[PDB]
Amino acid sequence: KPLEVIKIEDGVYLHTSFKNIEGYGLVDSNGLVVLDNNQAYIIDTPWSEEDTKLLLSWATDRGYQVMASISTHSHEDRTAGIKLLNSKSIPTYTSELTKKLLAREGKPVPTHYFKDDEFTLGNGLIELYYPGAGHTEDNIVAWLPKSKILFGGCLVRSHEYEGLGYVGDASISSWADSIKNIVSKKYPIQMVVPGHGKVGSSDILDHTIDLAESASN
Amino acid sequence: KPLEVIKIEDGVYLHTSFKNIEGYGLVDSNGLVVLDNNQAYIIDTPWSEEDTKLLLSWATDRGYQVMASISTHSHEDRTAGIKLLNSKSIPTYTSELTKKLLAREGKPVPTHYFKDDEFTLGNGLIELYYPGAGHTEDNIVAWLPKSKILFGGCLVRSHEYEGLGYVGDASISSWADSIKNIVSKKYPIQMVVPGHGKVGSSDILDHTIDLAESASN
Ligand SMILES: [Ca+2]
Ligand SMILES: [Zn+2]
Ligand SMILES: [Zn+2]
Questions:
Q1: Distance from B19 to chain A by nearest Cα, in Å?
Q2: How far is CA B192 from the centre of its chain?
Q3: Which residue of B has its CA nearest to A166?
Q4: Of B126, B104, B100, the residue nearest B113 (C-alpha)
């Protein structure tokens, strides 16, 4: 089931990738395309090279110039399209840690990376922040000042999950602290976009804190 | 986690393998190892070829001889190990339809197949039967009389669930009538094994019928 792209705010589109996993069923994966006039920025690649191809087609069929992607942590559902973007000379970004994690796992690396706990993509359009470990040791979040959207990636859990998801790379006892660090930014959050599941409100943060503290206990 | 095998009756061992990551996390999937003396029959392979190897190694380290496997539908959670067993000259069985389906999606095929709605494996150790399309167009069930244990695969759910999993390759249209047949066999059921989740009892079945209206309505 191929890639779906839908407008969720002015200049912000939710892109959703799917798999049919035999034995489980339908799973989805979210990222964003953020536009700045005709420039397009990808927050997380679709889950596969093929769906990453469809996302670029989506952009070029609309005449958008894809300027860069940013991936929120090293897992395959965040980075599967980095290699294809690299072959198209489209700058790809992760944090330094995510990049070095990919490199260690023998995966394609972004051509660019950022060193501090905060960075910007699109010259202020996208604010990135590392709040601490949770879902992974390297997970970062993206704040969109204009649309008032926090892309939480997998550090956040949508309202239809009651588990933290895959925790083999997780720091469960760190996670709730890391969400509080996001809370401390006092972002005027209108919408939180999780890496999987439905978009919700700032409520998603509290729901994630509950999940983490309960798992940590 | 790697493979888990645990005795659930005399000469029967529930084997559980685990598929990872997703937005969901760990999911289990069950098959059985059935022993007649030192002769072992596998009902459903593990979910990867790596976990299949371990199930075999598990078998061989105990000086059991693996006689055959049977997969209960074409799905990878039922059939992923078929490639491996073939390479060990261990007979692999499915229904004739399941083999053609496997062939049809270009997947490894069993070396053996039965053609009618029923077939028995291992001098009465296992009876197989095709009750109709449900979970998939091709799913079958297996029954053990000595250990009084039913393996239902994904044609049945697990009380710990109220859903059904993927229903696109399915026929909820057919499902309900694909499962008013198993109780009529009048197996003395001590134990019922779904393809996913906790081992249950003969309370496990009826369940699946009302779940198959939920989507048929
Ligand atoms: Ca990237
Ligand atoms: Zn992840
Ligand atoms: Zn199935």
A1: 9
A2: 11
A3: B25
A4: B100
* Residue A20 to residue B166, Cβ atoms within 8 A: yes
State how far the Cα of A172 lies from the Cα of B45, in Å rounded to an integer.
Answer: 33
Q: Do B25 and A196 touch (CB under 8 A)?
A: no
- Strand, helix or coil at A103? helix
Name the domain count of chain A.
1
Strand runs (DSSP E) across A96-148, as ranges?
A: 112-114, 118-121, 126-129, 141-144
- Supply φ then ψ for residue A109, to 5 degrees: -105, 155
Is the alpha carbon torsion for A55, A58, A60, A62 positive or negative?
negative
Q: Dihedral through CA B183, CA B142, CA B190, CA B199, nearest 10?
A: -110
Of the candidates A25, A194, A195, the beta carbon closest to that of B165 is on A25
Q: Give the torsion sign (CA, A89, A94, A97, A102).
A: negative
Resolution, in Å, please? 1.9
Experimental technique of record: X-ray
Query: Which residues does a chain break follow in chain A (C to N more than 2.5 Å)?
Result: none
Instruction: Please give the DSSP secondary-structure letter assigned to residue A63.
Output: T
Residues in chain A, total: 217
Of B24, B26, B76, the CB nearest to A27: B24
Of A25, A197, A193, nearest to B29 by C-alpha is A25
d(CA B154, CA B131): 13
Which residue range is the domain that position B204 belongs to? Answer: 1-217
Ligand 1 center from residue A101 Cα (angstroms)? 13
Inspect the interface and report whether the beta carbons of A166 and B22 lie closer than 8 Å.
yes
Q: Do A154 and B75 make contact, defined as CB atoms within 8 angstroms?
A: no
From the list B23, B25, B77, which residue is nearest A22 (CB)? B77
* Distance (Å) of CA A180 to CA A158, A177, A208: 17, 5, 10
* The one-letter amino acid at B95: S
Residues 6+ apart with CB under 8 A from A105: A74
Residues of B whose CB is below 8 A from A25: 165-167
* CATH value at residue A143: 3.60.15.10
